[PDB]
Amino acid sequence: LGKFSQTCYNSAIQGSVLTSTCERTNGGYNTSSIDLNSVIENVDGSLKWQPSNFIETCRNTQLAGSSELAAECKTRAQQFVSTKINLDDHIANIDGTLKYE
Structure with missing residues (x-):
């Protein structure tokens, strides 16, 4: 569960917004943000x-x-x-996009 740090890098946090670059399933990198x-x-x-x-x-x-x-x-x-x-614990990377699970 979670462990998005295994396929994401240059992670950064500002206020309550989590922002990071994650790898896409079909190759390539995707960048997104989510409010924790x-x-x-x-x-x-x-x-x-x-x-x-x-x-x-x-x-x-x-x-x-x-x-x-x-x-x-x-x-x-x-x-x-x-x-x-x-x-x-719950923040994972699904297809290059972050999603709580």
């Missing part, structure tokens, strides 16, 4: 795979490592702490 906001939520300090507009309570979203997304999110105590989530 509809699938990531903040649970008492940690980002989880569930919709809730996490960026509304999180800031400084950036690309960490090859497939890890690191950001800072508010805990129930109103303090920003370090949080991370594995994009490889």
Whole structure:
């Protein structure tokens, strides 16, 4: 499931939009963008795979490592702490286009 990093490169993240170049099934490269906001939520300090507009309570979203997304999110105590989530869990590349599964 996911692992789009196996056939995509030059991946970049801006705000909540994931943008990357992925290989097409019949050869060639395709470039597309998708909003991770509809699938990531903040649970008492940690980002989880569930919709809730996490960026509304999180800031400084950036690309960490090859497939890890690191950001800072508010805990129930109103303090920003370090949080991370594995994009490889559900973000996959289908025919050169990114699609959550």
